[PDB]
Ligand binder design. Structure first.
Ligand code: THP
Ligand code: CA
Length: 129
């Protein structure tokens, strides 16, 4: 897989962010994870966490997987990096997202993310508390 440039337009919530990608505004949904909605327990924390990552980053990148690049809502489906740190994995490692929505063909980083979720669960972090 390959990282490609994007710039932040605005934080939305834990697993969605508005980015400019090839010069066009797009909402990106993070592959392989599910954060709680803002109105559920840990939703505000998950939103805050991703917001801090993307707003503080000097360089945001998006990495598509081998399968679908947009979902049925027109959202880009990617792994989203902030200064080289993947937000998808960082949310799971902190117990602020669950590995979820693992569809055959867009699942390159599944095992990396499961390893993180195991560690967050062992630490009883947040969602796992
Ligand atoms: C993460 C992801 C979500 N989706 C769709 C499945 C879910 O459909 P439904 O809306 O019908 O439930 C929705 C989950 O996203 P959200 O968790 O952002 O709501 O997004 C994909 O199709 N592919 C994906 O890779
Ligand atoms: Ca969600």
């Amino acid at each position: 897989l390959h990282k490609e440039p994007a710039t932040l337009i605005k934080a939305i919530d834990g697993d969605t962010t508005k980015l400019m990608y090839k010069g066009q505004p797009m909402t990106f949904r993070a592959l392989l994870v599910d954060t709680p909605e803002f109105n559920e327990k840990y939703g505000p924390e998950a939103s805050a966490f991703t917001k801090k990552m993307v707003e503080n980053a000097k360089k945001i990148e998006v990495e598509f997987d081998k399968g679908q690049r947009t979902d049925k809502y027109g959202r880009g489906l990617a792994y989203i990096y902030a200064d080289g740190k993947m937000t998808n994995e960082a949310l799971v490692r902190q117990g602020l997202a669950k590995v979820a929505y693992v569809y055959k063909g867009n699942n390159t980083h599944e095992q990396l993310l499961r390893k993180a979720e195991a560690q967050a669960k062992k630490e009883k972090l947040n969602i796992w508390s």
